Amino acid sequence: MPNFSGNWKIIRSENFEELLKVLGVNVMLRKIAVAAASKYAVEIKQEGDTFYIKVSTTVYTTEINFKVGEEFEEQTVDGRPCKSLVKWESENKMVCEQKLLKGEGPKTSWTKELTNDGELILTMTADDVVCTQVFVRE
Length: 138
Description:
The protein is mainly beta.
């Protein structure tokens, strides 16, 4: 049953720095982050339109819980709290618009997609900037 359910390890991370640049993260941190980001692991437990996603690195880990179509709360990538809401684009592509609780700043989004060759593809937008990360089953 080829659904999002599984354990994924990152294999590619195009443009991560630029996203963080755009979110106003200073150089030194951006680089410390980019190094961190080679050990991204995503565990996904998916039943119907309901999603458990654990996202860990070597030292940090978060679990978000969501049903598609139901507004929920998470943080951006730069870790600002936001109102998020996911919708399907197709059989195995969902996309999430984030709107900031407090504060002002860039237009953040994220999508998860399963390719027909069994990779997980995460894209994360902030304004004009698009970061892509590809994961494979652990």
